[PDB]
């Protein structure tokens, strides 16, 4: 990904590189399940 190459070869081969990586990842997941339940009773939505 990130390589900065300085090369001499003709006079001498002298290689000087600054190799840097910056990675950015953002993941956002927003899920909303709605369940209709009796009162004081259990009801269950399961999505899997």
């Amino acid at each position: 990904s990130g390589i900065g190459i300085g090369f001499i070869t003709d006079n001498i081969i002298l290689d000087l590189q600054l190799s840097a990586m910056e990675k950015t990842g953002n993941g956002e997941i927003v899920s909303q399940p709605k369940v209709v339940t009796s009162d004081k009773e259990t009801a269950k939505i399961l999505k899997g």
């Binding site: 990904s1 990130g2 390589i3 190459i5 090369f7 290689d15």
Partner: protein
Amino acid sequence: RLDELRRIVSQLDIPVRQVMIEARIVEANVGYDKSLGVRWGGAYHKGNW
């Protein structure tokens, strides 16, 4: 007693009640995925990202 029981019997002689239940499942999935690989390679001057 016979008559009273008969009246209640009349109430009891009722057809079992059927109901047609129609519950429908609707699923919609929309998906977009994009990936970009940006690539600069030259070996003459040894520059390649």
